[PDB]
A paper describes a structure:
Reactions were then initiated in the intact crystals by pH-shift from an acidic mother liquor (pH < 6) to a basic soaking liquor at pH 8.8, and reacting crystals were quenched at various times by flash freezing. Conformational changes in both the upstream and downstream nucleotides flanking the nascent bond are linearly correlated with covalent bonding. Unlike for native phosphodiester catalysis, only a single metal ion cofactor is detectable by crystallography during NP catalysis.
We reported that 3′-NH2 primer extension can be catalyzed by a modified DNA polymerase, yielding N3′→P5′ phosphoramidate DNA (NP-DNA). To add evidence that a single divalent metal ion cofactor catalyzes unnatural NP synthesis in BF, a polymerase A family member, we carried out a single nucleotide primer extension reaction in intact crystals.
Residue numbers in the entry: 298 to 876
DNA sequence: GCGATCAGCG
DNA sequence: ACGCTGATCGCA
């Protein structure tokens, strides 16, 4: 029903200087995954190629890697990384429909060509789930069915580039796509393909030691409970805590008693068992998620883990990281932090280098709100999280522990992003009228932040959306909801999204500038990870001193704000040591 | 599959 | 009744 050439060889007219290109990888995780078919649409026609013939053809491989042969694609990072696993370099991607759709409206959740095409009333292509099926029924269809589906996706991309670019231009987002998100896509592909090497001998030794400690704490829990039970059974855990031991019920879930860590900490003065339960869950979390879960995804021949950075998922412009998530590796408790010792350079005599922005969202907020006092604080390089801890806990700077600073950090962000006196009281275990009075004092010191919070909510009501410094956008229809609780969630999104999203814009530009500078200096150093406002690299020992000057400067200069940007950095033998 | 929980980033 | 996430687990 759509005409195309089912090609048995590669011809010259398939290699035009502009084409829509589909390199189809059906498995969710595209690392080392099969490429099941290829479609090309250009001015000369529509073509389907079997991967075994296209990817062994020297003219087609050359065409893929020629940056002056421009390709329009959907999710070009998936294709670029699967091709790297095939030893083939993909260059010249000038349009990525997934990223164009994400910028126009992140809430659409566009996950396939069909969902993006729907945004422009284009429906001559089927959803990928309709073709491959769901779950245990998932399968690559017959070649005639596969070919038409890939050709239809390519024709869709071919037709949709111009109307997507037109709307991007109207939103002031076309340079955001072409100069930020698409260059970042190629850098992430490199980072994902490089992977991070893991010390599996160390990891497995930790897991065995961990398993002994688990049973020890597990027995003490049974003994404190006077009986054995399933510690992870909420119904049995509830019967022990709030029925047998008759502890007060501070919180319910839609399902029953709450047993979250905040509740259990509040119950610590009543019974020693609740702290054993906390230690027990923490150890179990390390065992299940960060020992066993990480060993499951280590590629055995290289001892590398290859995360996937989802670039078109979060509503603020942040990345996310999956299978494994390398953005939530433990750090705060020393027991969990030790897991970072298992993350090691990929070559001997290389080192890990980590650099992160200091108080990034407060500096962005100072700039966007133009609050005189907050701008002055960062022009003085004050540590606002420490200064808030001193105030909260009535201590001196010398006496601020890491824990108090982490707590004050949640107070600072909580307040600027709309925490109530109730939530602040519960978080600080202070009274409610003291919490409300502290919030009032905070906005007396930063009235420009308060004005900003009021203004941004008004602007969202008028426009229907909020934007970031580099013109990312988030629609907030609920901001005019008549339901108070729904409207209130939307208002906090209007306060938070421009700040968190601008911080995401800045680190992304920093990554692009860093990569260009590393190439200009002919360094072997390369990016491994981004963790929202932190960049993690590895490099030969011999490059560390140049990187100590290069990386902070590139990061601090990524944008020019009304206050300085500040970067902290460390390096060491393992990720653990790069702090 | 979903909700609670908890690991991270601000 | 601050925001943005992903993985594991029990299932009230
Ligand atoms: Ca930081």
């Amino acid at each position: 029903k759509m005409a195309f050439t089912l090609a048995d060889r590669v011809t010259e007219e398939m290699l035009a200087d502009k084409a829509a290109l589909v390199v189809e990888v059906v498995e969710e995780n595209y690392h080392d995954a099969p490429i099941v078919g290829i479609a090309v649409v250009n001015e000369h026609g529509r073509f389907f190629l079997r991967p075994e013939t296209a990817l062994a053809d020297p003219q087609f491989v050359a065409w893929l890697g020629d940056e002056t042969k421009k390709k329009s694609m959907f999710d070009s990072k998936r294709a670029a990384v699967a091709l790297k696993w095939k030893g083939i370099e993909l260059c010249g991607v000038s349009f990525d429909l997934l990223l164009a759709a994400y910028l126009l409206d992140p809430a659409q959740g566009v996950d396939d060509v069909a969902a993006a095409a729907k945004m422009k009333q284009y429906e001559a292509v089927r959803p990928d789930e309709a073709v491959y099926g769901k779950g245990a029924k998932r399968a690559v269809p017959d070649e005639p069915v596969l070919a038409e589906h890939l050709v239809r996706k390519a024709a869709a991309i071919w037709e949709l580039e111009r109307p997507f670019l037109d709307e991007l231009r109207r939103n002031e987002q076309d340079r955001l796509l072409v100069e930020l998100e698409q260059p970042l896509s190629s850098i992430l592909a490199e980072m994902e393909f490089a992977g991070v090497k893991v010390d599996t001998k160390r990891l497995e030794q930790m897991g065995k030691e961990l398993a002994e400690q688990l049973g020890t704490v597990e027995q003490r829990i049974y003994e404190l409970a006077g009986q054995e039970f399933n510690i992870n059974s909420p119904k049995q855990l509830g019967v022990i805590l709030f029925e047998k031991l008759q502890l007060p019920v501070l919180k319910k879930t839609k399902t029953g008693y709450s047993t979250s860590a905040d509740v259990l900490e509040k119950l610590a003065p009543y019974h020693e068992i609740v702290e054993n339960i906390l230690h027990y869950r923490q150890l179990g979390k390390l065992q299940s998620t960060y020992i066993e879960g990480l060993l499951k995804v280590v590629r055995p021949a290289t001892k590398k883990v290859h995360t996937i950075f989802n670039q078109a998922l979060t509503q603020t412009g942040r990345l996310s990281s999956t299978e494994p998530n390398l953005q939530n590796i433990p750090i705060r408790l020393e027991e969990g932090r030790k897991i970072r010792q298992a993350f090691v350079p990929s070559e001997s005599d290389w080192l890990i280098f980590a650099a992160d922005y200091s108080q990034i969202e407060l500096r962005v907020l100072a700039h966007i709100a133009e609050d005189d006092n907050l701008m002055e604080a960062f022009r003085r390089d004050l540590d606002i999280h420490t200064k808030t801890a001193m105030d909260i806990f009535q201590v001196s700077e010398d006496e601020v522990t890491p824990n108090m600073r982490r707590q004050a950090k949640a107070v600072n962000f909580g307040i600027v992003y709309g925490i109530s006196d109730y939530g602040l009281a519960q978080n600080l275990n202070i009274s409610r009228k003291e919490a409300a009075e502290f919030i009032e004092r905070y906005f007396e010191s930063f009235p420009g932040v308060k004005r900003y919070m009021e203004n941004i909510v008004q602007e969202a009501k008028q426009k229907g959306y909020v934007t970031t410094l580099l013109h990312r956008r988030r629609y907030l229809p609920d901001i005019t909801s008549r339901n108070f609780n729904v409207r209130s969630f939307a208002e906090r999104m209007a306060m938070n999204t421009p700040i968190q999203g601008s911080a995401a814009d800045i680190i992304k530009k920093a990554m692009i500038d860093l990569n260009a500078r590393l190439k200009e200096e002919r360094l072997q150093a390369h990016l491994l990870l981004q963790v929202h406002d932190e960049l993690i690299l590895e490099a030969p020992k011999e490059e560390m001193e140049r990187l100590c000057r290069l990386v902070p400067e590139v990061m601090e200069q990524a944008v020019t704000l009304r206050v300085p940007l500040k970067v902290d950095y460390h390096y060491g033998s393992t990720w653990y040591d790069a702090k």
